[PDB]
Each structure stands twice: as structure tokens, then as C-alpha cells.
Design an enzyme around this catalytic site. Structure first.
Site, mmCIF file in Angstrom:
data_model
loop_
_atom_site.group_PDB
_atom_site.id
_atom_site.type_symbol
_atom_site.label_atom_id
_atom_site.label_comp_id
_atom_site.label_asym_id
_atom_site.label_seq_id
_atom_site.Cartn_x
_atom_site.Cartn_y
_atom_site.Cartn_z
ATOM 1 N N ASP B 139 0.871 -1.200 0.000
ATOM 2 C CA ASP B 139 0.000 0.000 0.000
ATOM 3 C C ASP B 139 0.902 1.242 0.000
ATOM 4 O OD1 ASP B 139 -2.446 1.329 -0.014
ATOM 5 O OD2 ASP B 139 -3.459 -0.047 1.609
ATOM 6 N N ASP B 200 -10.522 2.297 -3.248
ATOM 7 C CA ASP B 200 -10.956 0.993 -2.690
ATOM 8 C C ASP B 200 -12.420 0.716 -3.036
ATOM 9 O OD1 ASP B 200 -8.477 0.850 -1.365
ATOM 10 O OD2 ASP B 200 -9.350 1.437 0.577
HETATM 11 C C1 LIG Z 1 -4.705 0.552 1.240
HETATM 12 C C2 LIG Z 1 -5.364 -0.260 0.126
HETATM 13 O O1 LIG Z 1 -5.677 0.630 -0.945
HETATM 14 C C3 LIG Z 1 -6.622 -0.968 0.607
HETATM 15 O O2 LIG Z 1 -7.112 -1.902 -0.362
HETATM 16 C C4 LIG Z 1 -6.317 -1.681 1.915
HETATM 17 O O3 LIG Z 1 -5.230 -2.543 1.622
HETATM 18 C C5 LIG Z 1 -6.083 -0.690 3.036
HETATM 19 C C6 LIG Z 1 -5.157 -1.310 4.086
HETATM 20 O O4 LIG Z 1 -5.191 -0.547 5.319
HETATM 21 C C7 LIG Z 1 -5.570 0.664 2.483
HETATM 22 O O5 LIG Z 1 -6.594 1.579 2.071
HETATM 23 S S1 LIG Z 1 -7.166 2.593 3.070
HETATM 24 O O6 LIG Z 1 -8.105 3.461 2.335
HETATM 25 O O7 LIG Z 1 -6.054 3.396 3.608
HETATM 26 O O8 LIG Z 1 -7.826 1.829 4.147
#
Ligand SMILES: *[C@H]1[C@H](O)[C@@H](O)[C@@H](O)[C@@H](CO)[C@@H]1OS(=O)(=O)O
Ligand SMILES: *[C@@H]1O[C@H](CO)[C@@H](O[C@@H]2O[C@H](CO)[C@@H](O[C@@H]3O[C@H](CO[C@H]4O[C@H](CO)[C@@H](O)[C@H](O)[C@@H]4O)[C@@H](O)[C@H](O[C@H]4O[C@H](CO)[C@@H](O)[C@H](O)[C@@H]4O[C@H]4O[C@H](CO)[C@@H](O)[C@H](O)[C@@H]4O)[C@@H]3O)[C@H](O)[C@H]2NC(C)=O)[C@H](O)[C@H]1NC(C)=O
Ligand SMILES: *[C@@H]1O[C@H](CO)[C@@H](O[C@@H]2O[C@H](CO)[C@@H](O[C@@H]3O[C@H](CO)[C@@H](O)[C@H](O)[C@@H]3O)[C@H](O)[C@H]2NC(C)=O)[C@H](O)[C@H]1NC(C)=O
Ligand SMILES: *[C@@H]1O[C@H](CO)[C@@H](O[C@@H]2O[C@H](CO)[C@@H](O[C@@H]3O[C@H](CO)[C@@H](O)[C@H](O)[C@@H]3O)[C@H](O)[C@H]2NC(C)=O)[C@H](O)[C@H]1NC(C)=O
Ligand SMILES: *[C@@H]1O[C@H](CO)[C@@H](O[C@@H]2O[C@H](CO)[C@@H](O[C@@H]3O[C@H](CO)[C@@H](O)[C@H](O)[C@@H]3O)[C@H](O)[C@H]2NC(C)=O)[C@H](O)[C@H]1NC(C)=O
Ligand SMILES: *[C@@H]1O[C@H](CO)[C@@H](O[C@@H]2O[C@H](CO)[C@@H](O)[C@H](O)[C@H]2NC(C)=O)[C@H](O)[C@H]1NC(C)=O
Ligand SMILES: *[C@@H]1O[C@H](CO)[C@@H](O[C@@H]2O[C@H](CO)[C@@H](O)[C@H](O)[C@H]2NC(C)=O)[C@H](O)[C@H]1NC(C)=O
Ligand SMILES: *[C@H]1[C@H](O)[C@@H](O)[C@@H](O)[C@@H](CO)[C@@H]1OS(=O)(=O)O
Lengths: 390, 392
Positions: B139, B200
Site C-alpha cells: 500500500d 478501494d
Molecule cells: C490501502 C489499500 O488501498 C486498501 O485496499 C487496503 O489494503 C487498506 C489497508 O489498510 C488501504 O486503504 S485505506 O483506504 O487506507 O484503508
């Protein structure tokens, strides 16, 4: 409206949301607005258990009319799509132990652009009475002033009464007024058996959430006016169509019961999943909607993307609905003191709680000291019935 | 990324959309991010036909980590929720014939606030390799600057390589750039087996519409860079959860196949309807997604709340998806000249058309000059396979 009708919220079927203004009987004879469509639905309401569950009014929405009135100035059924005419369709619907609803507009045209009833309120009323119509939905399009809107809704109300026939009067007076001034609901109720408050439903979860959110925002103004003979109409049930998940369908059925809404299915009774049918035919949930006390429920609480709604019932019972408005993740835990429910009396000194949705489950005896704990599916609702022990 | 991995879009299960960052094992034990959740999910991937269908990667997302690195500056599994460590979970997962995915962040903290990988790319990469990790999702939260973002993603790529373990590398580099400057997809493709482009997904038709509308609007920028070893990632399949109608679920599966998307289910395999299971395990639609040619499809036409998408397949075959975006009324008729599909190639001089979604139905031989007539459910998709033929 003190006409002795809609002593409980009207139940039946209305073509609009599913069948719309489909005039193409050549390329689509099964989908088009025609007397065959209404006869097919009438047969299935009897054969498939709808009438037995209380769905009684088979209702025609817009686009049933010939493009012009007749020589004698009366509304006509389209001669091709309704060749036997409305009176004869009413006769068939009556022979099956059902009632027939039709549609007109307070203004100069219907919303879809057929003859308006402005100038013709008295004749149109007597036409409908002569045809054997049991219900009128009266839409608000092509009306140039609030004065004409009010006078028209009142005039059609008085004209229906004067025919001497028992005709359920479904109004859109609040909806068409609200952009310009706050409706007087006390006055609307004197003239109308139910009244559309808000924008047309469509086959979407967005639509359901916007109707619930409008209703909870405006509950101070609308909840107490509702009661036997006069209901808030949050528009059609769209359960059994294409746009709603199971949990969203459960939310619509549960909250239409809490809101003492008219239950007008707009679906295809020829093509409906067993699950959609059993939800719409759910005896315990219809019994909540149809509670003879007729006291509209309300939103008790909203926080942490949860809603709690409740409705007082006959015999010291309450309905309680808990909605999960978080559209991500899994079933989310919600707990509330049962002493916070039904104004403090539902569970004093105790109550038996039955879950009705999403499945029927006896939860047991809850003391006045108790907390109810539930997991609620995203966009889903848990519907409970509380019975006081005393 | 030329690591010989992800020659077809990666298929598996990722916990994030359905289980998120649930740390409360005391009050929500069935939902919490624990080794036991992953062990149980692994057993069901085998026993309930998921592995058979191609779903091979069992992936951990955020919130697996201890709050702090050990004395030797390595990452730790959370001692309460993962007491037996990643190594032993990797063994369990491998023993069932599956591959283990794990998560980390290019920056200083994971998006959920656990130890970031900056300053440690090499040790973390070696950690995962020693652990038996077969995939990394990386991420982009808590990154100072584009230089760090790009530097990190490039660094972790070579770091993973320097371990000589096969590790699918899943990047969010494009997604975490958009707020600063437009991504360079040839650079990103060099380092990454797949890349998140957009926000997301969640359990909603709104989310699906938003991912498809971003994709079609942006298709000239992203479609051609996709191919074996490097894919556009439109986020997880959410079929089997709560927010999608049957028709909206068919739309996700149809269009994730059209887009050559990695297929990462995020659902609960312990509680899934037979209907959602049959759709996710549909051999013919998975076969479109996994087409060895590996050329991403695109939106051909939009108008009158209709969409037509198509994807070229090996052997002069095409997949065609028709979407009804009207959220009212009944099934709508759509007709199109077969000549207009598959760049006029598909059905020259004929094609045999099989409907795959919402139900599988042989439609028969269509001559190059003929019309295709369909009816499409509101928020639904008709998915068709066109096979070029000389018969008829
Ligand atoms: C990063 C990724 O884009 C999402 O799919 C997920 O892996 C979380 C993990 O904490 C994160 O997105 S978030 O919008 O920061 O929650
Ligand atoms: C760290 O990073 C380096 C690169 O930075 C990376 O090395 C590269 O690894 C890839 C993946 O293995 C290598 O790609 C393979 O290369 C070999 C050799 O190619 C040369 O020599 C052949 C001799 O046959 C020549 O014909 C060719 O022109 C080249 O000059 C190929 O044999 C491999 O091809 C097979 O797999 C490909 C998929 O990766 C297919 O596209 C191809 O059709 C081949 O067949 C596949 O399917 C067959 C189906 O029947 C099956 O039988 C085969 O087994 C196979 O699966 C492939 O192109 C690349 O050469 C390396 N590049 C460099 C610069 O070294 C490391 O892998 C990476 N390390 C880690 C662990 O991440
Ligand atoms: C036309 O408008 C008048 C004015 O409201 C309506 O009169 C009302 O009719 C209802 C229903 O019949 C009356 O209440 C009922 O009384 C009967 C007989 O005692 C009883 O059995 C029912 O349980 C109910 O209480 C209501 O009192 C009456 N109001 C007045 C002022 O007389 C009339 O029904 C309307 N007619 C049509 C065709 O809509
Ligand atoms: C249905 O259509 C009819 C015919 O177009 C409407 O009647 C017309 O309504 C307008 C009001 O917007 C009247 O105009 C007014 O006339 C007076 C002069 O007499 C002027 O001082 C006002 O400023 C205004 O222009 C018009 O007289 C009237 N025409 C007739 C033949 O009655 C009718 O109101 C429409 N009904 C609805 C419910 O919209
Ligand atoms: C993770 O956090 C560390 C600790 O804060 C970050 O390290 C810092 O990186 C920045 C560069 O963006 C450095 O700032 C620069 O400092 C020098 C003077 O020392 C100055 O000349 C520059 O103009 C600028 O202000 C900073 O010095 C450095 N750490 C410390 C303790 O000073 C790191 O950048 C973060 N990592 C990521 C990937 O975001
Ligand atoms: C809202 O409408 C109602 C009904 O038209 C109005 O209440 C009537 O008001 C007159 C004068 O006060 C009384 O003679 C009647 O007794 C009332 N009827 C009923 C059943 O209450 C009310 O005035 C209107 N309110 C506002 C704010 O305009
Ligand atoms: C995006 O990045 C890639 C790879 O880093 C760049 O590809 C280079 O293209 C030039 C020709 O213009 C080649 O001579 C180089 O060898 C390529 N690779 C590298 C590493 O530089 C690509 O040019 C970049 N695109 C843009 C428009 O900036
Ligand atoms: C008026 C009503 O609000 C709606 O339920 C339906 O009856 C149509 C009939 O034409 C009309 O709404 S519309 O938004 O104007 O189509």
C-alpha cells in the site's frame, strides 16, 4: 379522509416502477401497458397467494388513456391497449375478489402527457365511479399554481365523495407543493387516504436510503398525522425486481412496515424469486404494517452508521428495526438497553422478543435491565417484535 | 514485471473488504484478523472447490503485524492474533496446495498505522521470503513525496527479486500518485505484476459503477499497458457479501473478466449462497478472465444508459458485455450489427455466439451481416462469447 377506507394501509400492485409507460405492444406485448398485463397480474394475485396475504388493489398508473377525450368530454382507455375498456376490466378484477385502481392528474396533462383532469374534475370523478374504479392515484404534473394544486386535490376529493362510490384517494399534493411551501398535513389528511411526500422510488438502494432519510428528517411534521384513513406514502415496494440485494429488500419490507406505508408492489408477478415472494407474503411483517392501531413508527436513533426505528402496536407490542448503513465489511454488532425501546414501557418489567427479519427466531425474555445485542448485515435490517409480559 | 509470474491475472482471496482491520478477537472472534480465520479460509478454498476454479492465493491485508519490529528490526506477526507466526501459517497454506499473500506499506506506517517498510525494504523482503510468502500487496500510505513513493516501489521490487523467491508483487503506486501527477504505466509495469489505479471498492453498486466509469473514461491511458506479467487492478470481487443484487454481482464478474482484472474475492467462504458460489466458480467466465492472449478489454459504446464492452481472446474469439445502467423499469432490448463487434473480425464470415451470463445459452451461428438481439436487466450485464467460424 373519513370515507371509511384505508383503515389499515392500502395493499396491492401498481404497474409504474416495473412497467413504466411502455406503449410498444407490437415489439413487446408481454411488457406493454394493456388490459392483458392487468388480467395476468389479477390471475396471479389470486393463484399465487397475494390476495390471501392482503394484496387487494390491482392499480393502473399513467399511460392507460387515449390521447384525446371523447365527443362527450370523458377520459377514454386507449382503444387498442384497453379494447374492452376500464368498466369491463373492473368487472373482471371484481370477479376475482380484487379492487381496481386507476390514475389521473390534477393539472392540464398527466405527467406522461395524456389528458389532464383540470376543468374536468366532476366528470372524471363520475366516469371513474361509473366504470367501477375502487381507487384513484392523482398525480401533480402540469399545474401552474399552488392555488390550482390545492383547489384541484380538494375538488377531486369532494367530487369522488359525491359519486357515492367508495374510492380510495391517493394524492401527490405534498410532493408537488414541498418545493414552494411547507404542506399542511392536517388539511391534506382531511382530503386524502394517502399522500406521496417524496421523489419517485426506483430499483436502487440509493432510492430507498433517500426515502428513509427524507422520512426521518421530516418525522416531526408527518408521523402524528398518519392513522386509520390517512397514511404517508413513501412510494412502491420494488422487492422482486433487479436493483436490490436480499438485505436491501429486507430493509424495504421492514421499514415500510414500521412506517405504516401503503404496500404497493411494482414487480412482475409472472417472474418473481421464491425468496422475494416469501418476504412480500411474510404474515408477521404484514401484520405489523396492518396493525389496527395505525400509529406510524419513527426513527428513535442514528449514530455509528446505525439507525433504530420503532412503531407502537396494539396490545402493548412494539416493532423495532435496526439498520446497518455501513456499506463495507461484515455483520456489525449493535446493542441498545431494552429500557430505551418503546418509550420505556415495551420491556417494563420485561418483554418477549421475536426477531422477524431477516429470519424468524424467538430471542427470549428481556428484563427492564437488559441490553438487546444484534449483528446487522451491511444495508440490512433486523426487525423485532416486543411483547410486554403484563 | 518480468519475474515469470502473473502470466494470467492472479486469482485468490483477500480479507480486506469483508474483514477490514477488526482487532477485537474478544467480542468479534469470527470477524477478527487471526491465523485461525486464514487457516479456516484455507481449508474451505480446498474443500469447497475454490482452488479447483483457480483461486490459489490466500492473502493477508493490513493489521497482521505486531505494533513494533523485534530487537533485530524485523517485522513480527501480532503475538495474540498470530501466535504461531507467518512461517507456520505459510506451511499450513502450502500443505493444502495454496500460496500465501501478505501486505506491507512503502511508507513509515501501514494505512492502519502498523510498522511501515521504509528504511527496511531489503530486510522486510528477506523476512517475507524466509517466511514462505508467495505474494506481496504494498500500500502507499505515509509516503513523503513522489520520489520516495517511486523509490520505495522500485526498491521493494528489486529487494524481493534479490531474494530469488517467486513473489507476486502487487503495487498501489499509480493510485497514490494521482493526487500529485499522472502515472507512467511503462515504468510501473517494469516493477509490478499488478497495480491499483482507483479508490478501494466497497459492498455497493455505487462503488462498482464508480470503478467502471473511471476505467472507461481513462481507458486510452491504461488498456494497452496491461498484458502477461502486468495487469490493471480494479480492486476485489465483493460477490457473496451483502450490497449487490444478483444482477449487480453478474455485472462485477462479467466486467472483471472483460478488464483482465486480478480476481481477489473478499467475502466469507464459510457463509456464501450457492448462487454467488456458482457465479464466482463459473468455468467459462474465469476462462475469459484467464485468456492466455492477456489483452485487456474496453468500452466500445455508451449511450441511452447502455454500455457495450468487448475483449479480444486467443483464437479470433471475443467476449462482449452489454450493461443496462437504467435503474428503473424492466429488461431493455438492445440490438447491434455483429459486424460492429470484435473490430469486424469476430464474425467474419460467421461467429457462433454463446451467452454465458446471466445464464449459459447457445445462441447459434451469426453471419457477418446479421444482428444480435438481447434483453438486459437493470444494473445487469449480458456476457457473450463470439467464436470466429467458417461453418454458416
Ligand atoms: C490501502 C489499500 O488501498 C486498501 O485496499 C487496503 O489494503 C487498506 C489497508 O489498510 C488501504 O486503504 S485505506 O483506504 O487506507 O484503508
Ligand atoms: C529477477 O529479475 C530477473 C529479470 O530482471 C528475472 O529473470 C527473468 O526471468 C524470466 C522468467 O523466467 C525470464 O523469462 C524466461 O526466459 C526464458 C529464457 O528466455 C531466453 O532464452 C530462450 C531459450 O528458450 C529464448 O528462446 C528466448 O528468446 C530468450 O532469449 C524463457 O524460456 C521463458 O519463456 C517461457 O516462459 C514465458 C513466461 O515467462 C513464456 O512467455 C514462454 O512462452 C516460455 O514458455 C512458458 O510456457 C510453456 C508452455 O508450454 C512452458 O512449457 C514453459 O516452461 C514456460 O512456462 C521466459 O521468457 C527472463 O529470461 C529473465 N530475464 C533475465 C534478464 O534474466 C528473475 O526471474 C527475477 N527473479 C525472481 C525470483 O523474481
Ligand atoms: C363522503 O364524505 C362523508 C363525510 O366524511 C363520509 O361520511 C363518513 O362516512 C364514514 C364511513 O361510512 C362514517 O363513519 C362510519 O360510520 C358507520 C355507521 O355508523 C360505522 O359503521 C363505521 O364504523 C364508521 O364509524 C363517518 O361518520 C361519516 N362522517 C360523517 C360526517 O357523516 C362518507 O363516507 C363519504 N362517502 C363516500 C362515498 O366517500
Ligand atoms: C391549464 O391551462 C389553462 C389554459 O392555458 C390555464 O388557464 C390560464 O391560466 C393562466 C394562469 O397562469 C391565466 O392567466 C392569467 O390571466 C389574467 C388575465 O385574465 C392575468 O392577469 C394573469 O397575470 C394571468 O396571465 C389565464 O387567464 C388562464 N386561461 C384561461 C382560458 O382560463 C390553467 O390555469 C391551467 N391549469 C393549471 C392547473 O395549470
Ligand atoms: C519517514 O520518517 C522519517 C523521519 O521523519 C523521514 O526522514 C526524513 O526525510 C526528510 C526528507 O523528506 C528529511 O527532511 C530534510 O531534512 C534536511 C536536514 O536534515 C533538510 O535539509 C531538508 O530540507 C529536509 O527538511 C529528514 O531530515 C529525514 N529525517 C530526519 C529525522 O531528519 C522519512 O522521509 C519518512 N519516510 C517516508 C518514505 O515518507
Ligand atoms: C392546517 O389545516 C387545518 C385544516 O384545514 C387548519 O385547522 C383548521 O383551522 C380552522 C381555524 O383555526 C378551524 O376552524 C378548524 O377547527 C381546523 N381543523 C382542524 C381539524 O384542526 C389549520 O388552521 C391549518 N394550520 C395552519 C398553520 O395553516
Ligand atoms: C516512462 O518510464 C519508462 C521506463 O522507465 C521510459 O522508457 C524509456 O524510453 C526511452 C525512449 O524515449 C528509452 O530510450 C529508455 O531506454 C526507456 N527506459 C528507461 C528506463 O528510460 C519512458 O520513456 C517513460 N515515459 C515518459 C513519457 O516519461
Ligand atoms: C407521477 C408519480 O409521482 C409517479 O409515481 C408516476 O405515477 C408518474 C406517472 O406519470 C409520475 O411521475 S413522473 O416523475 O412525472 O414520471
Amino acid at each position: 379522509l373519513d370515507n371509511g377506507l384505508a383503515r389499515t394501509p392500502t395493499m396491492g400492485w401498481l404497474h409504474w416502477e416495473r412497467f413504466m409507460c411502455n406503449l410498444d405492444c407490437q415489439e413487446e406485448p408481454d411488457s406493454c401497458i394493456s388490459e392483458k398485463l392487468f388480467m395476468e397480474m389479477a390471475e396471479l394475485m389470486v393463484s399465487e397467494g397475494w390476495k390471501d396475504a392482503g394484496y387487494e388493489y390491482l392499480c393502473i398508473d399513467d399511460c392507460w388513456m387515449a390521447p384525446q377525450r371523447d365527443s362527450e368530454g370523458r377520459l377514454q382507455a386507449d382503444p387498442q391497449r384497453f379494447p374492452h375498456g376500464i368498466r369491463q376490466l373492473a368487472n373482471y378484477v371484481h370477479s376475482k375478489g380484487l379492487k381496481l385502481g386507476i390514475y389521473a392528474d390534477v393539472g392540464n396533462k398527466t405527467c406522461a402527457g395524456f389528458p389532464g383532469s383540470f376543468g374536468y374534475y366532476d366528470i372524471d370523478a363520475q366516469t371513474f365511479a361509473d366504470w367501477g374504479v375502487d381507487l384513484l392515484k392523482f398525480d401533480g404534473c402540469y399545474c401552474d399554481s399552488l392555488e390550482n394544486l390545492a383547489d384541484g386535490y380538494k375538488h377531486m376529493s369532494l367530487a369522488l365523495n359525491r359519486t357515492g362510490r367508495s374510492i380510495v384517494y391517493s394524492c401527490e399534493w405534498p410532493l408537488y407543493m414541498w418545493p414552494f411551501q411547507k404542506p399542511n398535513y392536517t388539511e391534506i389528511r382531511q382530503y386524502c387516504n394517502h399522500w406521496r411526500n417524496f421523489a419517485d422510488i426506483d430499483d436502487s438502494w440509493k432510492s430507498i436510503k433517500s426515502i428513509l432519510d427524507w422520512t426521518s428528517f421530516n418525522q416531526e411534521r408527518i408521523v402524528d398525522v398518519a392513522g386509520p384513513g390517512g397514511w404517508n406514502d413513501p412510494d412502491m415496494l420494488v422487492i422482486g425486481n433487479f436493483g436490490l440485494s436480499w438485505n436491501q429488500q429486507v430493509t424495504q419490507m421492514a421499514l415500510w412496515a414500521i412506517m405504516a406505508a401503503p404496500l404497493f408492489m411494482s414487480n412482475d408477478l409472472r417472474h418473481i424469486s421464491p425468496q422475494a415472494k416469501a418476504l412480500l407474503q411474510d404474515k408477521d411483517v404484514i401484520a405489523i404494517n396492518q396493525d389496527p392501531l395505525g400509529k406510524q413508527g419513527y426513527q428513535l436513533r442514528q449514530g455509528d452508521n446505525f439507525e433504530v426505528w420503532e412503531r407502537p402496536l396494539s396490545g402493548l407490542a412494539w416493532a423495532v428495526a435496526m439498520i446497518n448503513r455501513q456499506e463495507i465489511g461484515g455483520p456489525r454488532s449493535y446493542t441498545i438497553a431494552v429500557a430505551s425501546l418503546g418509550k420505556g414501557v415495551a420491556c417494563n418489567p420485561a418483554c418477549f422478543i421475536t426477531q422477524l427479519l431477516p429470519v424468524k427466531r424467538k430471542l427470549g425474555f428481556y428484563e427492564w435491565t437488559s441490553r438487546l445485542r444484534s449483528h446487522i448485515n451491511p444495508t440490512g435490517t433486523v426487525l423485532l417484535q416486543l411483547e410486554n409480559t403484563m
